[PDB]
UniProtKB/Swiss-Prot annotation, chain A:
It comes from the Eukaryota. Precursor of non-enzymatic components of the classical, alternative, lectin and GZMK complement pathways, which consist in a cascade of proteins that leads to phagocytosis and breakdown of pathogens and signaling that strengthens the adaptive immune system. It is found in: Secreted. The modification Phosphoserine is found at S42. The chain holds residues 1280 to 1327 of 1663 of the full protein. It is linked to Complement component 3 deficiency: A rare defect of the complement classical pathway. Patients develop recurrent, severe, pyogenic infections because of ineffective opsonization of pathogens. Some patients may also develop autoimmune disorders, such as arthralgia and vasculitic rashes, lupus-like syndrome and membranoproliferative glomerulonephritis. Macular degeneration, age-related, 9: A form of age-related macular degeneration, a multifactorial eye disease and the most common cause of irreversible vision loss in the developed world. In most patients, the disease is manifest as ophthalmoscopically visible yellowish accumulations of protein and lipid that lie beneath the retinal pigment epithelium and within an elastin-containing structure known as Bruch membrane. The record marks R24, S25, R41, S42 as: Cleavage. This is Complement C3. The lineage of its organism: Eukaryota, Metazoa, Chordata, Craniata, Vertebrata.
Curated annotation (Swiss-Prot), chain B:
It comes from Homo sapiens. It catalyses: Cleavage of Arg-|-Ser bond in complement component C3 alpha-chain to yield C3a and C3b, and Arg-|-Xaa bond in complement component C5 alpha-chain to yield C5a and C5b. It is found in: Cell surface. Its cofactor is Mg(2+); Mn(2+). Changing E71A: Reduced formation of C3 convertase. Catalytic component of the C3 convertase of the alternative complement pathway, also named C3bBb, composed of complement factor B Bb and complement C3b. Catalytic component of the C5 convertase of the alternative complement pathway, also named C3bBb3b, composed of complement factor B Bb and additional molecules of complement C3b. Interacts to CFP; this interaction contributes to the stabilization of the active C3-convertase enzyme complex. It comes from the Eukaryota. This is Complement factor B Bb.
Length: 48, 91
């Protein structure tokens, strides 16, 4: 009975994903959690 | 000749530092015989600001120069950070 209360349904999702581009000056940082997972965060850049 | 001046002052040759505040160009139109296309392509284009002017009979342009000295501009030293090469904090 203690097992069914302390059982998690998932492991942690918390991804401090920062993107540095040489075309810009600021780092583009997103944090992806469990509730906001499966959500694409598109960042478009016309420079290659 | 204008594009040669901006290349010499390092304006537009970078993506992180445009340096547009280091060259301003103002063109004034004197007569009714005025090509508004040629005077617009020479003047600078900065944000929320005008640099092209068209007036007639000359004497009214002399009227704008005595009027501007009656106009007092509230100078604001707040929020000014100019890029000095001694970039320690509190600068
Ligand atoms: C006027 O023009 C001159 C010539 O372009 C310009 O000189 C530049 O000065 C800056 C510093 O103000 C230099 O930047 C640094 O230079 C050192 C070597 O001296 C490098 O090691 C540095 O790289 C590291 O440091 C950075 C942070 O400081 C880090 O972000 C980086 O990842 C590295 O760890 C850094 O590049 C620059 O090299 C010179 N350029 C030249 C061509 O000499 C001067 O600053 C201009 N004046 C003004 C007010 O802008």
């Amino acid at each position: 009975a203690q097992y069914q209360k302390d059982a998690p349904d998932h492991q942690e999702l918390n991804l401090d994903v920062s993107l540095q581009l040489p075309s810009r000056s600021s780092k583009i940082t997103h944090r992806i959690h469990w509730e906001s997972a499966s959500l694409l965060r598109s960042e478009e850049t016309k420079e290659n | 000749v204008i594009d040669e001046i901006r290349d010499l002052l390092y304006i537009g040759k970078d993506r992180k530092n445009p340096r547009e505040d280091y060259l301003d160009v103002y063109v004034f139109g004197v007569g009714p015989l005025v090509n508004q296309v040629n005077i617009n392509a020479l003047a600078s284009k900065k944000d929320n600001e005008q640099h092209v002017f068209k007036v007639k009979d000359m004497e009214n342009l002399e009227d704008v120069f005595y009027q501007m000295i009656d106009e007092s501009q509230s100078l604001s030293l707040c929020g000014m950070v100019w890029e000095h090469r001694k970039g320690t904090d509190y600068h």
